[PDB]
Amino acid sequence: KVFGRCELAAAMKRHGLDNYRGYSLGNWVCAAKFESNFNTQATNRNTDGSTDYGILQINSRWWCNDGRTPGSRNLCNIPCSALLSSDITASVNCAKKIVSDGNGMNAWVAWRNRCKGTDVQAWIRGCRL
Template sequence: MRTFLVIGALVVACLASASHAARTMDRCTLAREMSNLGVPRDQLARWACIAQHESDYRTWVVGPANSDGSNDYGIFQINNYYWCAPPSGRFSYNECGLSCNSLLTDDITKSVRCAQKVLSQQGWSAWSTWKYCSGSLPSINNCF
């Protein structure tokens, strides 16, 4: 019986931990948090569109292997070959100077900062989903 209780407690702890790590945002929550991090309001609708198409607003997503064997991480699906250090220890330029796992947390600060760096170096077209987000987008103003 004691073993059953210990195993049960471990399962509950794991489920609680997994549900905490498995944050799914929505368009307005993302816009408000990004605004609080200083992202210009005129960019928020584009960022929300990218997050929707890249990860469906999920912070914990690791994309399947790309053709070069790299993976994309987090709400903005940031590539590990160029921008973050993968947990495998595989080579990365790591331009954002962080672990890819730090892009998978509920706190999106590092994801936002790294995404802004990608934008500053490569522009919006760095995201393959940009084609869905390059035109006119619904206003984000109703989120504030």
């Protein structure tokens, strides 16, 4: 499912992401935009053999099992495939644990490279929330 901008912002807000660990809603929308173009089915393989999954490109080395990243952890306790569902619930709850891990949203390279320090609120502008 390819989310609309406002649609995803409302879904993320409903799942407790606005201001989660100090990160306003615009940060998550911005990250999803540049990680996955709002597409829940986005996957991208990394050079170490791990794969990024779903709306927030959650990585199989640490956070989910894809049966294909040897010596990996499954700290979100989910199959990576669940991260691709049109329902973002699994992606959101896993991201909550990623962003609590110490490094905040720097765990997402596109957030730090393209969202951090910009006007992220513009990403929820015009949305009814």
